[PDB]
Write a protein that binds this ligand. Structure first.
Ligand SMILES: CCCCCC[C@H]([C@@H](C)O)n1cnc2c(N)ncnc21
Ligand SMILES: [Mg+2]
Ligand SMILES: [Zn+2]
Length: 325
């Protein structure tokens, strides 16, 4: 399994695809069998293997473990985690995060991306609370139920024998790695994003400051959120396709909420849901602000905001006679 992975060395990024390091590249085009390899390539391209002296066999096992630690709902599967991770790599390469963040922080972000939805069951935090799941029992009172479970699953993978990519770290770094991984994964929750939004705008107002450690915090949260939503930054074929997976998942939960006598949200109810207006609402309230904050901090992230705005134009366009339900 893992010996087969490292039986030919770490492939360079250009050999996977020539446009691999570009924003136009859709990582979902890469076959699922070649994705663990692609992770190793990105980690070596960012020079994280040398920097933190990550043992390669251990990194390979960790990667394969993170992979099988996802289930197979329509959207929250390994391929989502992979595409979010690829996008984090695109941010490194194109927005040059090395000028803004510490190396250990960009490393944490990438690792977080791989783990950020570990063991997702195709349902959200409200459903866990509502169905009295053990996850809700463990985490509901602190908030962000699934997010704490994801981090917890990351930890259980990192402490599996032969997967501890941090085992040799200094005490100070091992700890910062743990704090950042938790904070970055928690940041993926809409509720969290809704809190720090005021502080994100103020950061974008005054200008980014490498000496301000709160700006690092907040920048990491914004970056994570923008990797998580990166399906909205590709072409219409990708974005239109991914909407089908998202609602496929949402509609399953909606059915399960009905079977326990709960009234699902409109977006979860296929009898109520008109996808165009829902995505338009998602695009303007959540997605476009996120990428407009990313543009304000990185002028080079202008082409991402436009493609999200474009995709929101495409929803209005195709609304003319789109499937009514
Ligand atoms: C700032 C954090 C936003 C979190 C929302 C995540 C959410 C589901 C799929 O988890 N999601 C992700 N893409 C979505 C989309 N195109 N339409 C509706 N919901 C979406
Ligand atoms: Mg999540
Ligand atoms: Zn996600």
């Amino acid at each position: 399994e893992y010996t087969k992975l490292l039986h030919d060395g770490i492939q360079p990024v250009a050999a996977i695809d020539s446009n691999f390091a570009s924003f136009t590249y859709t990582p979902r085009s890469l076959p699922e069998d070649d994705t663990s390899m692609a992770i190793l390539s990105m980690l070596q391209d960012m020079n994280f293997i040398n920097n933190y002296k990550i043992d390669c066999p251990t990194l390979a096992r960790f990667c394969l473990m993170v992979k099988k630690g996802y289930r197979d709902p329509p959207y929250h599967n390994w391929m989502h985690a992979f595409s979010v991770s690829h996008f984090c790599y695109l941010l490194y390469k194109n927005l040059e995060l090395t000028n803004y963040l510490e190396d250990i922080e960009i490393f944490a972000l990438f690792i977080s991306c791989m783990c950020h939805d570990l063991d997702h069951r195709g349902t959200n935090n409200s459903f866990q609370v509502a169905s009295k799941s053990v996850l809700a029992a463990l985490y509901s009172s602190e908030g962000s139920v699934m997010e704490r479970h994801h981090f917890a699953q990351a930890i259980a993978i990192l402490n599996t024998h032969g997967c501890n990519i941090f085992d040799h770290f200094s005490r100070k770094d091992y700890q910062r790695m743990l704090d950042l991984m938790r904070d970055i994964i928690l940041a993926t929750d809409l509720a969290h994003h809704l809190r720090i939004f005021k502080d994100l705008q103020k950061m974008a107002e005054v200008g980014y400051d490498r000496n301000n450690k709160q700006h690092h915090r907040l920048l990491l949260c914004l970056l994570m959120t923008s990797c998580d939503l990166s399906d909205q930054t590709k072409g219409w074929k990708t974005t239109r396709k991914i909407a089908e997976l998202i609602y496929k998942e949402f509609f399953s939960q909606g059915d399960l909420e009905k079977a326990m006598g709960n009234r699902p949200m409109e977006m979860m109810d296929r009898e109520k849901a008109y996808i165009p207006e829902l995505q338009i609402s998602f695009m303007e309230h959540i997605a476009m602000p996120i990428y407009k904050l990313l543009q304000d901090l990185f002028p080079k992230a202008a082409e991402l905001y436009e493609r999200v705005a474009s995709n929101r134009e495409h929803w209005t366009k195709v609304s003319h006679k789109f499937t009514i339900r």
